[PDB]
Paper text:
Present in the small intestine, cellular retinol binding protein 2 (CRBP2) plays an important role in the uptake, transport, and metabolism of dietary retinoids. All CRBPs share the same protein structure architecture. These small soluble proteins fold into a single β-barrel that shields the central hydrophobic cavity that constitutes a solitary binding site for retinoids. Access to the binding pocket is governed by a “portal region” composed of conformationally flexible loops connecting neighboring β-strands. By examining chemical libraries of bioactive lipids, we provided evidence for the selective interaction of CRBP2 with a subset of nonretinoid ligands with the highest affinity for sn-1 and sn-2 MAGs that contain polyunsaturated C18-C20 acyl chains.
Residue numbers in the entry: 0 to 134
The structure:
Amino acid sequence: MTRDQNGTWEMESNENFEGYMKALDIDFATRKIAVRLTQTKVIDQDGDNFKTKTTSTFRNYDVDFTVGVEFDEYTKSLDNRHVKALVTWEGDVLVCVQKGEKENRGWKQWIEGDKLYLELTCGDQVCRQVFKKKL
Ligand SMILES: CCCCC/C=C\C/C=C\CCCCCCCC(=O)OC(CO)CO
C-alpha cells in the first residue's frame, strides 16, 4: 500500500544521467550544465491522477497523466521528442513506456521508506535517481 507518491522530493543521487542523456542525443553543451543540477520533483496525486513537475535552475518539465490512459507526450525543453506514453501499475511501482523513435524508452518510479526512486531508461542506458522527501 505504497502507491501514494504525493509530496515534494529533492534529489540526493543521480547515477548515469550522463549516459541516459547521451542516449537521448542531448548535445554536449546541454549535458555539461544538466549533469550538475539538483532536481526537485513535485507530485500532486489523486488516486490514479498524477500532476508532476520536475524542476531545476536550467530546465523544468511538467507531465500529467492518469494511470492506464495512453497520452501524447512531448518532452519539451528536454530532448523535444513526441512519444505515446502509457503509465501502468506493476504492484506499487509506476511504470511508463514511452513508445517512439528511441527503443526501450521509459521510466519506473516508486516509494521505498522515505525515498522516491526513479529509474529512467533509453536504449542500453539506465539512470537511477533517488529523492528524499521534503518536510
Ligand atoms: C527537468 C529537469 C531536467 C534537468 C536537466 C536538464 C536538461 C537535460 C535534458 C534532457 C534530459 C532528459 C531528462 C528527463 C527527465 C524526465 C523526468 C520525467 O519524466 O520524470 C517522470 C517521473 O517523475 C515524470 O513523472
